[PDB]
Amino acid sequence: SDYERLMLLLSDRFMRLRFVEAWRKK
Amino acid sequence: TLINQHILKPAPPPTEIPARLQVKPPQPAAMKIPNRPTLLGGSAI
Numbered sequence: 001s002d003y004e005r006l007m008l009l010l011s012d013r014f015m016r017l018r019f020v021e022a023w024r025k026k
Numbered sequence: 027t028l029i030n031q032h033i034l035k036p037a038p039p040p041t042e043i044p045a046r047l048q049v050k051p052p053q054p055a056a057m058k059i060p061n062r063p064t065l066l067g068g069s070a071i
Contacts, residue, residue: 012049013049
């Protein structure tokens with residue numbers, strides 16, 4: 001599968017829920 | 027009426043070519059909504 005390895009060039013491929021569930025508690 | 031400023035002189039500042047890349051498909055894709063204010067000139071490969 002070197003066609004897929006060519007077809008995926010430059011692709012480069014819950015913490016913000018944690019800091020808001022504390023403030024929704026407050 | 028209003029009194030206006032004037033352009034000085036030919037002063038040359040060139041830009042430079044930075045290095046990173048991004049993929050992320052949401053509208054903000056950075057710190058805020060518009061993109062041409064928050065996109066790096068011309069990027070290197």
